[PDB]
Write a protein that binds this ligand. Structure first.
Ligand SMILES: CCN(CC)S(=O)(=O)c1ccc(-c2csc(Cc3ccccc3F)n2)cc1
Length: 282
């Protein structure tokens, strides 16, 4: 596909970035990236929202040892613009899991006072990401980390080139460790796209593996007491609430939205989401 710079983050970029020019005292919406770590997917939404909108992007500054560490770091970044709650948080896809942990940590900090934080999940959940990682893992040799590394880096290379799965798998499988798999992957992508930045790609390939690892290993400590809204694609089985009932003990509202996983933040889907958010800020 095109705009490959949407699959890449500036590793020396800021974690928190304005995504619209709305200047007002109304509390901002913070939007958490999909797995590629960029805020690109949110530009249409942000340009249409009548409240100040920021994006959270995944730079060299982000800790990826756990979803818990990542979420704590994104809360600290948010407080550089909004020191005090309540907080409006959304996440898309991989970002849905991360935003959920941020709201849990904010709940814990204030316990037992009820927070009036708002959480929106764009087509994912703690479980939606787990389901994906468990699928890819369950077609591999168990206990064979080299095969997991190979699988992750192969998927990354396939988002930049049209190379067949098996020929990328063959090239990466016999290599000594992650850093060699990363170096081989950047050389393959550079061949297809000679002007892309080697350090951007290196950071993107390595972090892709670490992001997947953090997501597998994630389970909320306790359940989220706040009320959540899920905005899931009309065109996707994992369940109607993507298993949020298992991790929330508050009001879980599900809206089905025109489009698929990739298109629901655009076109007809985007109109519905904008109307839902704009009324839902109430
Ligand atoms: C929410 C679902 N998403 C799809 C858009 S997503 O969030 O970004 C998403 C989720 C998983 C995978 C994937 C590829 S290989 C894989 C298995 C795996 C785990 C850990 C380490 C190495 C691995 F090899 N897991 C890729 C993408």
């Amino acid at each position: 596909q095109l705009n490959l710079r949407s699959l890449l983050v500036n590793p020396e970029g800021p974690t928190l970035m304005r995504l619209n020019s709305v200047q007002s005292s109304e509390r901002p919406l913070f939007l958490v990236h999909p797995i590629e770590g960029s805020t690109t997917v949110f530009h249409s939404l942000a340009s249409r929202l009548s409240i100040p909108t920021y994006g959270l992007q995944c730079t060299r500054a982000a800790p990826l040892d756990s979803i818990h560490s990542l979420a704590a770091y994104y809360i600290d970044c948010i407080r550089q613009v909004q020191p005090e709650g309540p907080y409006r948080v959304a996440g898309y896809s991989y970002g849905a899991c991360v935003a959920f942990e941020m709201c849990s940590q904010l709940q814990a900090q204030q316990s037992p006072a009820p927070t009036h934080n708002s959480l929106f999940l764009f087509d994912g959940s703690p479980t939606y990401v787990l389901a994906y990682t468990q699928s890819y893992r369950a077609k591999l040799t168990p206990g064979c980390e080299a095969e997991a590394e190979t699988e992750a880096i192969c998927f990354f290379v396939q988002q930049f080139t049209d190379m067949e799965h098996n020929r990328v798998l063959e090239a990466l499988l016999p290599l000594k460790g992650l850093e060699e798999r990363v170096a081989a992957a950047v050389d393959l992508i550079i061949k297809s796209h000679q002007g892309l930045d080697r350090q951007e790609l290196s950071f993107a390939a390595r972090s892709f593996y670490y992001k997947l690892r953090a997501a597998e290993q994630y389970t909320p400590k306790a359940k989220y007491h706040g009320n959540v809204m899920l905005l899931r694609a009309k065109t996707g089985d994992l369940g109607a609430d993507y298993n949020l009932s298992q991790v929330c003990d508050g009001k879980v509202s599900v809206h089905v939205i025109e489009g698929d996983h990739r298109t629901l933040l655009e076109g007809s889907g985007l109109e519905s989401i904008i109307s839902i958010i704009h009324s839902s800020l109430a």
